[PDB]
Design an enzyme around this catalytic site. Structure first.
Site: not given
Ligand SMILES: Cn1cc(-c2ccc3nnc(Sc4ccc5ncccc5c4)n3n2)cn1
Ligand SMILES: [Cl-]
Length: 281
Positions: A146, A150-151, A164
């Site tokens: 994936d 976005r990831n 992700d």
């Molecule tokens: C639109 N969007 C996509 C994501 C995302 C993508 C990959 C992914 N792989 N692990 C995570 S969780 C995560 C990890 C670190 C972060 N740091 C800051 C803000 C949000 C966060 C969220 N994510 N989150 C967050 N918003």
């Protein structure tokens, strides 16, 4: 409402996961500050982190698979891959996954933001970082499945992290032809997705194949079609994208070759060509 006693866990696996486990007094989870993901604090030295609160796990075998994934992911260490800082398993099987805080969020939203002013050089640089992340993952025989803008995530230093996957975990418009047909994924199908990710970069986050029905992608592609060359995409980079979408999986470049080729293209720019948004996107 199922009760789980965590002491029913295998003592060998519990010992093996200890270096992944974060002590209850080492992490201050800010349940008040919501990013299900919350802001967190980790001690080493105060470290800002993202704490992903999973659903409660009430099966000991599932708890076991959670701890095993944590161990494997802990060793996926590279500057362009999101690291696992560690895991917490609270009383009654309530899991926390601790990831580094990504100040600039996901890469797709970052490039889409009209207040950011990326150059061709910046965008290719982002692509190069992703290729380096993927070269690492492929070396670990890990198939992402994936990969998309976005990831991927950006930290405060504008370092791109492929994310992700693992404990941080159909996207048909990013999928290789053979994956759409067989539902099997390989490193060579990750290369196809990487091609699409490069297209996303050079369009500043446009959706691929806008006027195309999700269900209708295999038939579209089989008419002999590929994503068009973005207005600000250099010719050699579009040629790279076409190689990533080779109909023969084995003929697609490796991530190691992509790193090499993209590093060369990147090196020719000096950050003077600003990338503007397509009116139709
Ligand atoms: C639109 N969007 C996509 C994501 C995302 C993508 C990959 C992914 N792989 N692990 C995570 S969780 C995560 C990890 C670190 C972060 N740091 C800051 C803000 C949000 C966060 C969220 N994510 N989150 C967050 N918003
Ligand atoms: Cl430039």
């Amino acid at each position: 409402t199922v009760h789980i006693d965590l002491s029913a866990l295998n003592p060998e696996l519990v010992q093996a996961v200890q270096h992944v486990v974060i002590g209850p007094s080492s992490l201050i989870v800010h349940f008040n500050e919501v990013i299900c993901v919350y802001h967190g604090t980790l001690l080493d030295k105060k470290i800002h982190c993202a704490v992903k609160s999973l659903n409660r796990i009430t099966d000991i075998g599932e708890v076991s698979q959670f701890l095993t994934e944590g161990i494997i992911m802990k060793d996926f260490s590279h500057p362009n891959v999101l690291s696992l800082l560690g895991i917490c398993l609270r009383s009654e099987g309530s899991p926390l996954v601790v990831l580094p805080y990504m100040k600039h969020g996901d890469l797709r939203n970052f490039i889409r933001n009209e207040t950011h002013n990326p150059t061709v050089k910046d965008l290719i640089g982002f692509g190069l970082q992703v290729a380096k992340g993927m070269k690492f993952l492929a070396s670990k025989k890990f198939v992402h499945r994936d990969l998309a803008a976005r990831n991927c995530m950006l930290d405060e230093k504008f370092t791109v992290k492929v994310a992700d996957f693992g404990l941080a975990r159909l996207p048909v418009k990013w999928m290789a032809l053979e994956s759409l047909q067989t539902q099997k994924f390989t490193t060579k199908s990750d290369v196809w997705s990487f091609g699409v990710l490069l297209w996303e970069l050079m369009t500043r986050g446009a959706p691929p194949y806008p006027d195309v029905n999700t269900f209708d992608i295999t038939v579209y592609l089989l008419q002999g079609r590929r994503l068009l060359q973005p207005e600000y995409c250099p010719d050699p980079l579009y040629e790279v994208m076409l190689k990533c979408w080779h109909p023969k999986a084995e003929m697609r470049p490796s991530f190691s070759e992509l790193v090499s080729r993209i590093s060369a293209i990147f090196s020719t720019f000096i950050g003077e060509h600003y990338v503007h948004v397509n009116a139709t996107y």
